[PDB]
């Protein structure tokens, strides 16, 4: 159940919810080192680019993402995405 | 013919086409000052948030955007969106 496969419309909502610093926290939890995170701030849309990059692995499931969101104490985002 | 009204899937192309610094140049041409532009780097997706902010005006037409792209020497982006 790959994250990539997710329709643009829900992905759009994912990205909206990872606002501010949250994509950085998520990236840390996903195994990205801080300088690797910093590299993504060069993109026009750091959060999308991070997820496009991460989303190219085979392990990059929606549920893997939700789990990483739980692990950074953002279950509110999970609740929000699921409701 | 408002930019906002544009379908998400074309807005995706726009944002992708404004890679790197381009949205900063675009914003400058659109009337935003450098520190005002700098404020959008706090968002997870600066380019989208800038366009969302710009797009709330009634004058924020796709064609106004195209003209700002010409004025910034990015006719290539215009060509791409049009073809
Ligand atoms: O629609 C789903 O497949 C979905 C389900 C849950 S529980 C959380 C986020 C989701 N999104 O947005 O993909
Ligand atoms: O589809 C259109 O209305 C469109 C037309 C031209 S000429 C350029 C960009 C566009 N996009 O992407 O909206």
From Swiss-Prot, chains A, B:
Subcellular location: Cell membrane; Cytoplasm; Perikaryon; Cell projection, Growth cone
Domain Death: 20-83
Annotated protein name in UniProt: Tumor necrosis factor receptor superfamily member 16
Location of this fragment in the whole protein: 335 to 417 of 425
The record's account of how the chain is modified after translation: Subject to intramembrane proteolytic cleavage by the gamma-secretase complex, giving rise to an intracellular fragment that is rapidly degraded via the proteasome.
Task of the protein: Low affinity receptor which can bind to NGF, BDNF, NTF3, and NTF4. Forms a heterodimeric receptor with SORCS2 that binds the precursor forms of NGF, BDNF and NTF3 with high affinity, and has much lower affinity for mature NGF and BDNF. In response to proNGF binding, the heterodimeric receptor with SORCS2 activates a signaling cascade that leads to decreased Rac activity, reorganization of the actin cytoskeleton and neuronal growth cone collapse. Plays an important role in differentiation and survival of specific neuronal populations during development.
Domain notes for this protein: Death domain is responsible for interaction with RANBP9. It also mediates interaction with ARHGDIA and RIPK2.
Taxonomic lineage: Eukaryota, Metazoa, Chordata, Craniata, Vertebrata
Assembly and binders: Homodimer; disulfide-linked. Heterodimer with SORCS2. The extracellular domains of the heterodimer bind NGF. The cytoplasmic region of the heterodimer binds TRIO. NGF binding mediates dissociation of TRIO from the receptor complex. Interacts with RTN4R. Interacts with TRAF2, TRAF4 and TRAF6. Interacts with PTPN13 and RANBP9. Interacts through TRAF6 with SQSTM1 which bridges NGFR to NTRK1. Interacts with BEX1. Interacts with BEX3. Interacts with KIDINS220 and NTRK1. Can form a ternary complex with NTRK1 and KIDINS220 and this complex is affected by the expression levels of KIDINS220.
């Amino acid at each position: 159940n790959l994250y990539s496969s997710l329709p643009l419309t829900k992905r759009e909502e994912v990205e909206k919810l990872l606002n501010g610093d949250t994509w950085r926290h998520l990236a840390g939890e996903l195994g990205y080192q801080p300088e690797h995170i910093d590299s993504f701030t060069h993109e026009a849309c750091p959060v999308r680019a991070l997820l496009a990059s991460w989303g190219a692995q085979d392990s990059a499931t929606l549920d893997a993402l939700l789990a990483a969101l739980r692990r950074i104490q953002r279950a509110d985002i999970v609740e929000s995405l699921c409701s």
